[PDB]
Amino acid sequence: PQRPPVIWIGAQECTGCTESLLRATHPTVENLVLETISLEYHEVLSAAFGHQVEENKHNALEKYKGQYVLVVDGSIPLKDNGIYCMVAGEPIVDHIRKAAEGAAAIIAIGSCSAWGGVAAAGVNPTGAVSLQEVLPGKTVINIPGCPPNPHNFLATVAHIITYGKPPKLDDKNRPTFAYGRLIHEHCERRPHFDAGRFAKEFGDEGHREGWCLYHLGCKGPETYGNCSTLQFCDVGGVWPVAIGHPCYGCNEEGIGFHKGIHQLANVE
Amino acid sequence: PQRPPVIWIGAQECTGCTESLLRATHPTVENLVLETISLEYHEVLSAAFGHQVEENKHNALEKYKGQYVLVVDGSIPLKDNGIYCMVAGEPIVDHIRKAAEGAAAIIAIGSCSAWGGVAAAGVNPTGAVSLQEVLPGKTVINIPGCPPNPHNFLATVAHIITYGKPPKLDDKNRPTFAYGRLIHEHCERRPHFDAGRFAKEFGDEGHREGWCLYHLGCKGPETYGNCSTLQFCDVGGVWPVAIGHPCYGCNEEGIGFHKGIHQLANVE
Amino acid sequence: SQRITIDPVTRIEGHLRIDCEIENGVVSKAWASGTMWRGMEEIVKNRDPRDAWMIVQRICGVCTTTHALSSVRAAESALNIDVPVNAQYIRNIILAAHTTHDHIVHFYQLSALDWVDITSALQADPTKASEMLKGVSTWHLNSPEEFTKVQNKIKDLVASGQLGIFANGYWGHPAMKLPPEVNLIAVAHYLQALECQRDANRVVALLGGKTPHIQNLAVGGVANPINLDGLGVLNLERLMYIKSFIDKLSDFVEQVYKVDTAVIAAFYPEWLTRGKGAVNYLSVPEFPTDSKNGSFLFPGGYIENADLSSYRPITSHSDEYLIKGIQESAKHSWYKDEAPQAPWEGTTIPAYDGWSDDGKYSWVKSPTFYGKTVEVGPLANMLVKLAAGRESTQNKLNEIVAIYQKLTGNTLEVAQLHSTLGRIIGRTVHCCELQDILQNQYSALITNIGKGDHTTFVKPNIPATGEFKGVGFLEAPKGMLSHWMVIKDGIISNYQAVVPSTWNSGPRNFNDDVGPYEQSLVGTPVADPNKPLEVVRTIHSFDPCMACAVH
Amino acid sequence: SQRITIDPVTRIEGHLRIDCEIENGVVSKAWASGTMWRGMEEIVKNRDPRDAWMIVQRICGVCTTTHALSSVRAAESALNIDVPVNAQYIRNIILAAHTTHDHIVHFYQLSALDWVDITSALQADPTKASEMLKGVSTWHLNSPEEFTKVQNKIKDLVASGQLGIFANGYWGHPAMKLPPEVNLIAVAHYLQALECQRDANRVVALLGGKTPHIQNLAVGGVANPINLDGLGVLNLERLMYIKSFIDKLSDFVEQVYKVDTAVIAAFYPEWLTRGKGAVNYLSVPEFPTDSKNGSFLFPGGYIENADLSSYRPITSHSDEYLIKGIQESAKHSWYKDEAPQAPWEGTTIPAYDGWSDDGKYSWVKSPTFYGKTVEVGPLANMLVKLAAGRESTQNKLNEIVAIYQKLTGNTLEVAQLHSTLGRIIGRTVHCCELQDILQNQYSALITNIGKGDHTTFVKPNIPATGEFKGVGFLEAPKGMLSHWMVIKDGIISNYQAVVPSTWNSGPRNFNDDVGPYEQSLVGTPVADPNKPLEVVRTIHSFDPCMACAVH
């Protein structure tokens, strides 16, 4: 049978959001591209290059008009008329707005496209902004994290394919199955927080008993996500806090890349 | 290169403690028996039967006197002179006491051998007792659960092989890495317990949001174990509470098989 | 002539003793004995009906899931509860995936070393072994390179002088008939089987909460919370993960297990002519798909005197013909009350007095169906499906017969299925058909959630007065299972389990008639009475489970 | 003279434009251009030194881990901190497992479709393809049945009419030399590679807390809590799980990746005679094993004018000769300050004025070593190890040459390694040697914990006044990496990253000298200037990373 089409464009990306797919198991990246979708444009994996791959993109935008999912990783730089990211001699903001015109659904994968992320931090050298800021007339589905667990993306695409609509979203257009709860309101170290059992430095006695990381700067009290339950890499038991390091707030605008690692979170 | 010898004897077992090994990944059962140990006696997998396999047990207890690890699953029945489990025409209590005389280390795998378990519950029809009760002058290492995660057993055997002694034990001779903490003192639903967010029935709105299972009968507040952290089957996210059902207390004497599913736990 | 004892029987679940009189080189008379009892029916008595399933699941850890599901079905029967359809889809995926693990482990880890000589595999040419499978299998791990790696693992084990559980085996016995190359193929497949069964149990774990011993059931449905949009519950990401494991099972089952079953029959064709245990067979229908505990995907029935053409169909777990026929006797068992008992009126009063050839010699009871001995399990299951004219079962049997024909130039008729090898073939056919059950029930669950049905549980009420009787039927890996609960004044006043290995392994009955294990052994040739491999070959074909048989 | 542009270059990390002047079908001059900038050096300024590593790790998600490890080494250099040996073992296992994933994905997912024609694979005979590998590999998944399954997946994708990322490829190009059978083998190995690289990243995840972007580092050591007897920390069970994935990597690396590298060389021998980028090579030593940030398992050094016999060894990350020689220029880059700058005095002031052939044409800076252009990465790393007389490296290269000699009848000399195919060979040799690094460092960690050392972290103090400077070196998958930190009054006053793809991809320098990418393209034959596959083959051999090059 025919497979649902996808167009993937990278703006000011590090490629970590594409690389998340190479850790996925349900589906694996080979089953995603041979069975689940038709990946019509993706510069990291494409056999074609240069003029051939730009022709392939134009052909797919015409053939699949009103049908494809558009995915963007990385921030979009507006300073100096778009010149901080140029592909085929044109500002990436122009490639993204052209591709958005015919999209059935639009997804910002990662903190950079969802809210500006690391590339928009500090002084913001390039005037980097979010995908929603460049497409004010469109509903952008945000899948934040640096990078997210790849299944936060893959189960969102599967809901669009299988049931013909997006998953339920919060007021930041994030899927509720993945972002509907604070990490601290579903964390297995909450008993230690409640008892005042805290690690004070890495390698101290409390740290070596798996105690709460709040006083090392854990941002779980102010970050929405599924890192304590879904976790990462499908091996069991693997997320930052379980390994021994505080959450940094990478999902959440104003927390990750703004607050210091050891700065304390506000608690509701 | 010679592998450390192991003798495994089943008493009033259901075979679930042996079947736990078929879910293990580190090591898999095939790497366990070809690379990690020499399994000198195990009736579920042995090529030999009858007189040949009893000849092989005798030869092994003599060859490896003072060197082998003895493992028992199931309770040991003392009522009516031991006749509720008879192998090769003799009470299993006599096979176990003979094998214990030459053991380097002795492990009770599962709640039945650790404390009597389901087979000693209710009126105890067969006078079923624990391995430590039939071996009063010996130090028995207890690995409870019905059955335990197989790595609670495999990492205990690895500590004996690699470092030449048992892992650190609590006052019930349970390894601290697996049994050192209450499930409720490291449970990811503790935030919901603290806020009074409880499931009242399976399928209700709070149950369908992943709320605390205390009012369904969860025994986490009175059960030592690693079910919330190590979990089961190495796929990620799989333990009874994560799937939607309360802990029944199967690790803990006086809790599992004694208290009703929906009976409330005492909280410390 | 002489008397032998086989104690313990290995490569089974639990504690079994087999005795045989040998006359003129063949078994003339046999005794089967279960040598361990716990009293699980007494342990569960006087409890709340809702608690039983968590206790009686521990009857067995090899057939984990099965006693849990039969127990909740018995309470639902007594109480008149209709289970939500989503709870049926979840219970069905768990049973089908568990049974796939169970059959694969029986063929390879438990039975193969009766037919395969691992020493002979050291003499094999790995290239000739791979060439033998061209045009009977498409499996991707039959290369000479795979077989050389496996041969080097055997060589290293033997070179260490520590054979352990592979030692003092039946190496060179005259009943061992495979060429060196086929021994090496079988050991490679034994190791590959361990990966397939682990994937099957990952399906079970994601719905059960763990395995062994699932923890997601309830009287009234299941504990899984269905919410595609929920964090921490059964959402679309968790369902996609389950599907990833379901999809990994088919290739091994179809291209390795199914093909090995035909290859063993081709090398051991006299084992199609011995090991008949009975002339009567019973199976129950399984995998209900409606809102009222029925509309089964697999059919059930009763066959009398081996006549498929006049069998009696069973389409309901409430069938009064099936319920009224079942009794158990303890005349030749170590219990006090000896006359045949209907299980709602059953007792289990221990009365051990030691072994007597003509008196009591087992902890296993003797079940009958309207006074007759009956075989249960995969041979019963297959023969009932062929009597029903089920085309999926016909077609799957024909694929095994076609491989046998290509290897031998001979065909297989239904008369040859009443045998040690026919029993093994019925088990393989069941494992193959279960892969379509898993795809069917996964699709049914996705589709029903999409229609807006997220229901999983009906909370029970239990009247505090009255006496209520319920029965839960289940087609388990070893055959028809039934749990029988009587509720009086709100608590369990009687609990009786009648388990498939009880039917097959039970001793001589109230009329001194012989059950399937003991019947199947008459006529078995025994070349060496000190090493009775031929007896263990026929007994393993039944997949004995003695924790199940005795409880 | 014809002028072509390749924009975008695909199957790399990030945003690259390549321009070429072509004279009579031969490249006469080239330009490399990085077309995206973020200003990561400016984003991290004016922060606490302890926070840099979490921010600058986001320079790149393909070479994840590398910028995190270089950043904590740079702060430890400035502050004079000696890292605990257990923290070194854990950092080393992460970097070696990550680099294994990176090299496998580069050879298969990024580079193979320059050399392999998927449409030609449809004409292959799967049995002939399998026979070609007899006595060339011992891999267990080279059967005709594996190759038939893979051929059928290609057939089904083509029949759908939806080729997607396989569409409008270079199928039938005159530079495509493999026979149909070898194209089919390569596609099978492309799919098998995805399983091996997933197991490498499971090692990284269990120590890092996730991947991409690890979260277990600190200025002063690591955040892993070592306690063999602790619940919820790095205990013996967790270490056993790590080892189970380390053990799964070797067979694919040695029996598939190493063999395919020799086979591509055997079919493309003119690619040993083109793609030379430089005559000077640099690498740093890697995998420290003592208590004082030294005693490296792999050596480093500097080769001038291709002379291995007179190279300069580098044994310390504090080597003043290495430190003093490094500068960067922006004369042909889009930044304001153009004269060569030592990185502790570096600026990054954007000055975009559009493309000029003779002026500014890239966001990449131009690095030099004492005023010379230098190639970094696996060709430099392999040549330095051969100059050091490292037996492990000579023996691994000799295994690749033995396979090449079996297929062609010819040997390889060191002069033939200064080439597009020599660069690919150096990357494979690295991936093979890293498997012994993993086994060595896992054993070291287990042994050290057994002696009673559970230490992992030295808490830093950072003076609130004064100005002090540090540099962190690391041998990354693409070559020598350095991060340069200046601290003033407790916060970062300057931060400069000099990254391996900066050395190789940078534009013409302050003396208009040509760097490796641009020099490598001179002489390249181009059969079809509309489809310049030969240019992309040479550029892909450097493994371009433009997020890295530009930051």
Ligand code: SF4
């Ligand atoms: S969200 Fe993180 S991983 Fe994804 S492009 Fe941005 S920096 Fe990279």
Ligand code: SF4
């Ligand atoms: S502060 Fe962090 S480690 Fe502590 S309970 Fe909250 S989320 Fe968990």
Ligand code: SF4
């Ligand atoms: S502890 Fe549980 S699983 Fe193990 S023998 Fe006892 S009942 Fe069976």
Ligand code: SF4
């Ligand atoms: S009662 Fe049970 S579900 Fe609730 S927090 Fe405690 S252990 Fe977790």
Ligand code: FCO
């Ligand atoms: N299958 C199985 Fe166990 C037995 N006999 C049950 O029921």
Ligand code: FCO
């Ligand atoms: N490897 C890698 Fe990335 C580049 N170039 C860095 O450092």
Ligand code: F3S
């Ligand atoms: S740093 Fe990011 S990955 Fe999760 S644990 Fe915190 S939101």
Ligand code: F3S
């Ligand atoms: S019932 Fe047992 S398996 Fe763990 S969750 Fe409770 S101790």
Ligand SMILES: [Cl-]
């Ligand atoms: Cl739903």
Ligand SMILES: [Cl-]
């Ligand atoms: Cl320790």
Ligand SMILES: [Mg+2]
């Ligand atoms: Mg209700």
Ligand SMILES: [Mg+2]
């Ligand atoms: Mg019974």
Ligand SMILES: [Mg+2]
């Ligand atoms: Mg220093």
Ligand SMILES: [Mg+2]
């Ligand atoms: Mg720089």
Ligand code: NI
């Ligand atoms: Ni990079």
